Paper text:
eIF2B is an ~500 kDa decamer, assembled from two sets of five subunits (Kashiwagi et al., 2016). It has two catalytic sites, each comprised of the bipartite ε-subunit whose two domains embrace the nucleotide-binding eIF2γ enforcing a conformation that favors GDP dissociation and exchange with GTP. Engagement of unphosphorylated eIF2 in this catalytically productive conformation depends on binding of the NTD of the eIF2 α-subunit (eIF2α-NTD) in a pocket between the β- and δ-subunits of eIF2B, ~100 Å from the catalytic site (Kashiwagi et al., 2019; Kenner et al., 2019).
When the apo eIF2B and αPγ complex structures are compared, the binding of eIF2(αP) is associated with an en bloc rearrangement of the βδγε tetrameric unit of eIF2B. As a consequence, the Cα atoms of eIF2Bδ helix α3 (helix δ-α3, residues 247–267), which intensively interact with the eIF2α-NTD at the eIF2Bδ-side of the gap, are displaced 3.2 Å (on average) and its helical axis is rotated 7.9° away from eIF2Bβ (the root-mean-square deviation [RMSD] for the alignment of eIF2Bβ is 0.7 Å). (A) Overlay of the eIF2B apo structure (gray) and eIF2B in complex with two eIF2(αP) trimers (the αPγ complex; color-coded as in the adjacent cartoon).
Numbering used by the authors:
A (entry chain H): 166 to 518
B (entry chain D): 8 to 98, 119 to 351
C (entry chain J): 40 to 468
D (entry chain E): 1 to 11, 26 to 134, 155 to 238, 258 to 295, 342 to 444
Amino acid sequence: QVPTRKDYGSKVSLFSHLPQYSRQNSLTQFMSIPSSVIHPAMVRLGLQYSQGLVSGSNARCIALLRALQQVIQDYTTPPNEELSRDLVNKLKPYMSFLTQCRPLSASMHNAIKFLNKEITSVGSSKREEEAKSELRAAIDRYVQEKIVLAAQAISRFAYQKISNGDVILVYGCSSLVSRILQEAWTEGRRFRVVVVDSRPWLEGRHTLRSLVHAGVPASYLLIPAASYVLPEVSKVLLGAHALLANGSVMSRVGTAQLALVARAHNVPVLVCCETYKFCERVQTDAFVSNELDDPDDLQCKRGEHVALANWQNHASLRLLNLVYDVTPPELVDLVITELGMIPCSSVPVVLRV
Amino acid sequence: GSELSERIESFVETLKRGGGPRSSEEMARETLGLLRQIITDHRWSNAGELMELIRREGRRMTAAQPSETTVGNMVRRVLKIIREEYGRLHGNEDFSFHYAQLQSNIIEAINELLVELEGTMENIAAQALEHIHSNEVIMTIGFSRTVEAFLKEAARKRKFHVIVAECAPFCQGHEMAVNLSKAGIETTVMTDAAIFAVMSRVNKVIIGTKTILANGALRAVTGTHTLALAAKHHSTPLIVCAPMFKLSPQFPNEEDSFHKFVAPEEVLPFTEGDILEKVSVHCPVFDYVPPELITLFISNIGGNAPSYIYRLMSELYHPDDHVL
Amino acid sequence: PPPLQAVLVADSFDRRFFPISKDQPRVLLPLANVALIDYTLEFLTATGVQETFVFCCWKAAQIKEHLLKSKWCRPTSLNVVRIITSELYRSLGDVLRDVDAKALVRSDFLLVYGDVISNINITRALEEHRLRRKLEKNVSVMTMIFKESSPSHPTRCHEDNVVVAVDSTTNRVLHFQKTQGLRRFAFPLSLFQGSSDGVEVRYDLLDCHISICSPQVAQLFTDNFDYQTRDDFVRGLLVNEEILGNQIHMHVTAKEYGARVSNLHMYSAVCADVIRRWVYPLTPEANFTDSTTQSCTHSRHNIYRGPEVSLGHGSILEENVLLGSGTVIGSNCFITNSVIGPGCHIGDNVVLDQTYLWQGVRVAAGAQIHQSLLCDNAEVKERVTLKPRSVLTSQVVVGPNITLPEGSVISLHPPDAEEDEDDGEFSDD
Amino acid sequence: MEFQAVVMAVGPLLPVGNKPLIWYPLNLLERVGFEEVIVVTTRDVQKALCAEFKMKMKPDIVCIPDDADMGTADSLRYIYPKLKTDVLVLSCDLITDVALHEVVDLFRAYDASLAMLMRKRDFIGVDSTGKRLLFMANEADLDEELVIKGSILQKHPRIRFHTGLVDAHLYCLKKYIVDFLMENGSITSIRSELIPYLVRKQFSLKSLDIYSFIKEANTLNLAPYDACWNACRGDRWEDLSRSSAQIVSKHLVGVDSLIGPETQIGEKSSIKRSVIGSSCLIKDRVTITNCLLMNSVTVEEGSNIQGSVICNNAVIEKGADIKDCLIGSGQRIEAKAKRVNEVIV
C-alpha cells in the first residue's frame, strides 16, 4: 500500500500537529514502478507536486483536474458494483496520496467537493461510455466557467477600478493579478507597478518577468522594505490563495504583514479571488492549518560559508517556514469576483448562497 | 602631523567603503581613539579654535558615510565635553582663559568616557534579567551584539524561546540564531515575511537598533518597522535594547538618504538576465520606526520611556551641535 | 608579502569611440560626470593596490594633467600612482614588453585596462591564486576574473561573449574564444584528454578584463613579438600548452560587479548601471573623488540632484536621473534615465528619454532627445527631434525643425563623423 | 499497465556466471513492480532461445523468437504490435543496484520523453542541474571539433561535459518516440541513431526533453571477458540481498564465496575470492586461485591457477600451472604447460 513519508528534522513546539515534509525523500521510493495501488496519473501528479513544480493555485487546480480527467478516462467498473460509488471509493486513496505529497489547498478542496458531488448525480442506468463522456464534459465546463471566465470578468471589473499614474502594488506569483494588469495596460490606461516578493520561495520574479514582457514598468524589493514604498502606493492588489468564511483572506506568507503596513500607511487594500475559493472553513490564527515547507531551504548562500550549513546538529535550533498567512477581515477592503466588487465581510452572504 | 593625518585618511576610507570595524561599539572606540589623537598631538591653542577644528573634521567624518552615525554622535559628545570642561575651568565666548591643563583635563574626560563605554554590554546584560520570565517568547530581528549578550546571559537563570526572524535583504539573522542556539535557548528562525502570523504568539519584541533619534523614533535594520507595527497592532511591548552612544540628536526629515540604498545586486541578483534593464530594484537596509510604537529603551542607565529621550539629548549633546 | 602592483594601460588600443576619441581619449569620458580613469584608480585603491603604473599613448598631456589634479596624485594617497608614458608602444603586448625591459614590476600585478567600472574586492581571488602558485612551483601564471550573467543582459555587447571551456575541479581554463558572429562553436577535443573529471564549458561569463599575471607572463610576452592582446595571448598559450604549459586559471564572482566600457552601447548600459547603485560603494552620492563640483546628494527614486540645479515649474523628474551642478531645467519639462552633467541648460516641453549629456550642452525648447549622447557644449536649437543612438558631439549644433534619422552621428570633423556640424543635418558645407 | 518493460537481447552465450545473466535484469524488473515483462530473441545462435530461457523461476514473461539477424531498434519495431504504453527497454546485460525509483522517477517527474541511466569516448553533455542533458554524440560522427548549436548555449548557459560515462542501456521512452521509430526506417539502432537524434532535436507547445541521471553504484558488462570477470567478482558480494539457498558442508578453505547447492565440499583445497557454486568436485588439492570457475567443471590432483576462467565442460587436473587463460567450452587440457596465453577455442 501507500506508505506515509516521515517528517523531516524537527518542527516548532507550537506546530507539532502539522507535517514538515522534506524534498529529497519523496514518496516514489516506496511504491511499485508501474504504480499499482495508485494510478500512474495520480502518482505523477503527487510527485511533481512534492518536487515543487506547480505552485500557483490555479495551476494546482488545473493540473489536478487534468489528471482526474485522465483517471476518469481509464476507470473500469468492477462487476456488480455501480460506477457512482466505486469511483469515489477509489478516489479516496488518491486524495490521501496527494495530501501525503503536498497538502491540499482550498482550490483543490473545492474542486474535489465539486467532483464528489457531481459524480453522485449521475444515473445508475447510465453506461460507462456516456457517463464518462459527461464527466469529462462537466469537468471542462467547470475549468472553463470558474477559472477562465472568472479571470475574464474580474479583469473587466478591475479595469475600471485602476486609475492613471497610481503605482499599483502587487504581491508575488498569481495568475489572476498578472492577467488583470497585462489586460489593464493594453486596454488604454497607463500606470506603474511595484512588485514585492519574499524569500526563500521567491515567487515574485514570475510576476516580474511576466510584467516586463508587456511593457509596463515595474519595481522589485523584498517584502521587508515594503514599509518604504507605501508612501507612493495607491492600491494594493494582493494575491490570495484561499478565501474563508469569517471574511479573512488566507494567502502566501507575507500578505498579512503587507496588508497591515499598507493600512497603517493608509493605502486601500484589495484582493482578487474567483468563485471557487470561497470555502466555509474558518481560521482565526494562521497556526492551525498551514503547510510547513522543506525547512532546509531558508539557508541562503551568504559570503563563502553558508550560516546554516549543518542545521540540525544544533540541539535547540528549530527552523520552520509557514507558507500560508491569514489577513484579518478588517484590513481587506475588496474581493473582486465575477459577480461584483463585494466587500470583505460580505463573502459568506454572497459567495455561499 | 603626518601620522595623525594618515590615520584620519585610513579611517575616513574604511568608513567610506564598507563596514570597518565590524561592531558599532568598535567604531565608537576607534572614533574616540582618533579624536584623542587629535585632541592631544595636534596644533590648537584656544578652546574656540579647537572646537572649530573638531567641527571641520567631524563634518567630513560624518559626511563620508552619512548613515553610520556612531562616529557622528561620538564627535558631538566630545564637543559637549569641550563645552562642559570650558564651563568648569572658566571660573558664551571662547578665549584662551586657560591652557595645557585643559588638554590633560579633556584627556581625562575622554578616558572616563572610553571606560564607561567599554563596560556597556556588561551593564545591559547584568540588568537584562529583570525583563524575562520562564517560558515566554522574544523576537529579535537582525543580529545585534548587545541584544545578543542580553539574551545569552539572561538564559543562565531562566528558559524561554527566541523566535529570531532574519533580515531578508541579506540574511544576517542566521548567524544570530546560531550564536544563540550554541548557548542553547530553544531558538527558532523564520523568513521575515512571516511576522504578522507568528506575532499573535509573541510576549515581547527585543529589536536591536542602529541609532536612536530625538523623539525616540529609532533607525534600525530594515523590516523592523513592520515588526514594530505588528507589535503595536497586538500591543505586545517592544524593548528597544539600544545603548547610550547609539543616540543621535538629529531629527526625522532633517536628512535625505535617511536609509542606505545599497547595491541592489543582493535583492535581484545579477544572474537574472534581460529584465534588469527596465526594473528599478530598491534596497533600503535602514528603516524608520515611528516613535509611539516603541515602549522601553534599555539604555545603560536603566529603562526610559520614549517621550523622555529629549532629556538624554540635552544631557549628552549640546543644543547647538545638531548640524555640526 | 610584497606590495601588489597593477599595470594600467589607460588607452583603449582600438579606435572604438570615433569620432569622439579625437577630442579627448576614451579614458577621460565622463559616465557619472566623473572621468573613467578615476573609476579605475578608485577600484585599484579600494582593492588595496600599492602602485598603479598608469601607461599612456594617446594625449599624454591631457591624461597627465587631469591625473595630477586627481585625488591620487596628491601625496596623501596610500596608492601612489606613478605615471609612465611614451609615444612608442601601440598595443598591450608592447606594454608588457615595456614592463619587462624597464624591469619595474616585481610580482602579481593586475593587468587591468584603462576603463573598467568595478568594485571587485579581489583580495580573496588573489590569495587563492598565490596558493595555487606557490603550491606547485610556478606553473599558474594568469588568474582572470569573470562575472556571472545570463547571456541576454544588456551589459553584454556583440563582441564580448567569451565561451570559455573551464575545468571545474580547480577552476582551470582550457579554451577561450570570442563570438563575433557565430551560430556554432569549435572545441579542440584535446581538452578531454587527461582530466575526465569534467569540463564545465560556460557561456554565462562576462569578460571583466582584470586578468592577474606574474613576472613570467611579461617574460612570455617578450618571448613572442606577435602577442598583441590579452585575448590572443591566452589563446596562443592554451593552444601551445603542450610545451611550456603555464596553465591559466579562472575565478568567477557572483555578488560583486565589474564591466569594461568598450563601445558606446556597453557604455550606455554601464552608465545606467553606475547610476542605479549597481556598483555601490562606487556611486555618485559617495563622491569617491574629492571634489565639490559633482558632490551630489541622493534622493528618492534614485533621482539624484547635485547642488544648485534650480529646476523649473512642472519639471517632473521620473527615475534614475542625475543632475550635476549649475544646470537649470526649464518649465514643463520631463527628464528620465538621463545623466545631465554640469553647466547645462534646458527649455520647455523637452523630454529627455535615456539621453546622456556631459557639460555645456544647451538644449532649447521643444526638443525631444532619446538615448543619444551629446558631448561637450553640443548646443541644440528648438523644434528638433532626435532619434535613438543619435550621437552628436564636440560643439556640434542642430537647427530648427530638422530631425535626424535613427543612427546618425554628427560632429565637426569632416571625414570621421557620418555628417558635419551646421544649422541642421543639411548644408554640410 | 503504464509500462511494458521489454528487454533487449540481441547478439550458451547469455546466461553466464554464478547465476544466469538474464536473471539480473529480470530480477530488477520483478523487484520493483512489473508483473509482466517481454523479452526478445532471434535466430542469432538459435531461434529457440525461449526454450532454454523457460527454465527460470519467475515465469511472468512473454518471449518471442524472431527472424535470422537484425540490429536493436528494428527489434523494437518488430515488437511494436504488442506495445501500447511507455516503453522501458533494457539490456539483458545489466548488473547493478540502482533504485530504479530514481530513473523512472525522473522520467515521470518532468513529463519527459526519454530517461537513461549512466555511470561514471561518448561525449555526453549533462546540464548544470545534473539531470537534463544537452550534448550527446560519439566521436564516430564528429571528427576533431566538438560543435554546439548556439541556441542551446543561450538557453542553458552552463553546459557540463563528461568524457568517460559508461551507458547502462536502460531507457524509459514515451509513446510518440516509439511511434516515430516505427514510421521511419532509416534508424537501425537505438542508442546510436536515436539518442543523438533525439537530443539533436530538442524541439519538434510540444517540446521533447531527455534526462540522463548519473549515479555511482554499478555498471553492465558484455562479451568482454575482462568485464565479465570483474562483474562476477563484484556480484559475489552484491548477491547478499539480490549461498542464499544451498546444501553443502564446506570442510575446506573457502569463505564469503558463492557456495551453492547440488554439491558437497570435501577437504584440502584453498581457493578464496573465487566462484564455484553448483556442481562442485571439491575434494582434491586446489592451490590459491582467486578466480571464476564456470559450470560443468572437472579438476583434481593438486591444481593451481591465477586469475582465469574455464568455460563449460572444462578439464584441467594433475598439476595445473597457468595464469590468466580462458579455457574453452569442451576442451580438456591436462598434460601441457599453458603460459599467460589463452586456450585453443
